[PDB]
Write an enzyme that holds these catalytic residues in place. Structure first.
Site, PDB file in Angstrom:
ATOM      1  N   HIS A  62       0.833  -1.202   0.000  1.00 32.73           N
ATOM      2  CA  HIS A  62       0.000   0.000   0.000  1.00 32.73           C
ATOM      3  C   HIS A  62       0.870   1.256   0.000  1.00 32.73           C
ATOM      4  CE1 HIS A  62      -3.179  -2.835   1.007  1.00 32.73           C
ATOM      5  NE2 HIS A  62      -2.479  -3.221   2.058  1.00 32.73           N
ATOM      6  N   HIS A  94       2.215   9.104   1.152  1.00 32.61           N
ATOM      7  CA  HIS A  94       1.167   8.924   0.163  1.00 32.61           C
ATOM      8  C   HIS A  94       1.490   9.861  -0.989  1.00 32.61           C
ATOM      9  CE1 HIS A  94      -1.347   6.969   3.313  1.00 32.61           C
ATOM     10  NE2 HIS A  94      -0.637   7.783   4.077  1.00 32.61           N
ATOM     11  N   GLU A 104      -3.171  13.513   1.274  1.00 27.05           N
ATOM     12  CA  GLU A 104      -4.426  13.088   1.891  1.00 27.05           C
ATOM     13  C   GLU A 104      -5.163  14.293   2.465  1.00 27.05           C
ATOM     14  OE1 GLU A 104      -3.389   9.497   4.302  1.00 27.05           O
ATOM     15  OE2 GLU A 104      -4.254   8.606   2.510  1.00 27.05           O
ATOM     16  N   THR A 196      -5.652   6.521   8.133  1.00 21.67           N
ATOM     17  CA  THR A 196      -6.229   6.800   6.819  1.00 21.67           C
ATOM     18  C   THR A 196      -6.256   5.580   5.923  1.00 21.67           C
ATOM     19  OG1 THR A 196      -4.186   7.530   5.763  1.00 21.67           O
ATOM     20  CG2 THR A 196      -5.465   9.207   6.960  1.00 21.67           C
TER      21      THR A 196
HETATM   22  O1  LIG Z   1      -1.533   5.656   8.983  1.00 26.44           O
HETATM   23  C1  LIG Z   1      -2.222   4.602   8.845  1.00 26.44           C
HETATM   24  O2  LIG Z   1      -3.294   4.629   8.192  1.00 26.44           O
HETATM   25  C2  LIG Z   1      -1.773   3.287   9.462  1.00 26.44           C
HETATM   26  C3  LIG Z   1      -2.564   2.166   9.323  1.00 26.44           C
HETATM   27  C4  LIG Z   1      -2.175   0.962   9.901  1.00 26.44           C
HETATM   28  C5  LIG Z   1      -0.974   0.911  10.590  1.00 26.44           C
HETATM   29  C6  LIG Z   1      -0.180   2.043  10.734  1.00 26.44           C
HETATM   30  C7  LIG Z   1      -0.590   3.227  10.168  1.00 26.44           C
HETATM   31  O3  LIG Z   1       0.179   4.382  10.294  1.00 26.44           O
HETATM   32 ZN   LIG Z   2      -0.393   7.705   6.095  1.00 20.99          ZN
END
Ligand SMILES: O=C(O)c1ccccc1O
Ligand SMILES: [Zn+2]
Ligand SMILES: O=C(O)c1ccccc1O
Ligand SMILES: O=C(O)c1ccccc1O
Ligand SMILES: O=C(O)c1ccccc1O
Length: 258
Positions: A62, A94, A104, A196
């Protein structure tokens, strides 16, 4: 769980497996700079990264995470809106397929090319897994990236990405100094929100810096060569791994600065 950023498994679908997706304090949000309120009782941020110990960099399908030794108070965030000590566990980004999208959070509906999240957990909860179950368990420092001049402190990250191209690959990543990713000013906005990505838990005090950092077009182009897919699976470039802005609902964004 087969969530992602594609047409069939992207942010509009996440609520079917993660019903908190339509909750009361979801992130990210648009930061309306004319509606945020200066709070004079907000303290300056205390970023204490001098003893930080980076260990590894991981492509998790991801994004990529740079992970730190969080078994001692080596890299901590305190002050600002926070009560207590928050330990750095990892950072990630991101980013977009084009320079006009990728962040974001947005600022007056403006999107930046990317956004850096430095993730910290409240030491009173003992470990990250417990902290994500608490409304004050995490503090995420968010930093916008705009395309312009290169960021020298990012280049060590860029140069390792070829070794973690696909999902599940990791590489040793010791002696990285996260202080090289910070802008000059620590002026910030803050509000209560969530992770997020799934599981979207509502456990984050967000601290979003007003000053973006500049990265070069070549630096962000190297992010866009990463893959969401594992080795030997059909190639899907890791781009547009951002969730769009969610409703603010019954929340106020506070500013540390006038
Ligand atoms: O920032 C996120 O969405 C996140 C999600 C799962 C684990 C660690 C994370 O920082
Ligand atoms: Zn993030
Ligand atoms: O899994 C993803 O995140 C994804 C993203 C873009 C296109 C297809 C995909 O499966
Ligand atoms: O050389 C790079 O910058 C690179 C970055 C990500 C994936 C594969 C790569 O060769
Ligand atoms: O393992 C595979 O299925 C594969 C497919 C395409 C290219 C390289 C590969 O190893």
């Amino acid at each position: 769980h087969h969530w992602g950023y594609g047409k069939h498994n992207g942010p509009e679908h996440w609520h079917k497996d993660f019903p908190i997706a339509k909750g009361e304090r979801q992130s990210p949000v648009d930061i309306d700079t004319h509606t945020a309120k200066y709070d004079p009782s907000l303290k300056p941020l205390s970023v204490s990264y001098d003893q930080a110990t980076s260990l590894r960099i991981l492509n998790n399908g991801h994004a990529f995470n740079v992970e730190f030794d969080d078994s001692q108070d080596k890299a901590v965030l305190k002050g600002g809106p926070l009560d207590g000590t928050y330990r750095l566990i990892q950072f990630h980004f991101h980013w977009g397929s084009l320079d006009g999208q990728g962040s974001e959070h947005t600022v007056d509906k403006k999107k930046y090319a990317a956004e850096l999240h430095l993730v910290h957990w409240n030491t009173k909860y003992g470990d990250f897994g417990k902290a994500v179950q608490q409304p004050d368990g995490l503090a995420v420092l968010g930093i916008f990236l705009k395309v312009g001049s290169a960021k020298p402190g990012l280049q060590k990250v860029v140069d390792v990405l070829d070794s973690i191209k696909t999902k599940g690959k990791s590489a040793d990543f010791t002696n990285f100094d996260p202080r090289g990713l910070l802008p000059e000013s620590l002026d910030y906005w803050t509000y209560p929100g969530s992770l997020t990505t799934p599981p979207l838990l509502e456990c984050v005090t967000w601290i979003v810096l007003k000053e973006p950092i500049s990265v070069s077009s070549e630096q962000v182009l190297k992010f866009r060569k990463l893959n969401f897919n594992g080795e030997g699976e059909p190639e899907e470039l890791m781009v547009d791994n951002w969730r769009p802005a969610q409703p603010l609902k019954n929340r106020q964004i506070k500013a540390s600065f006038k």
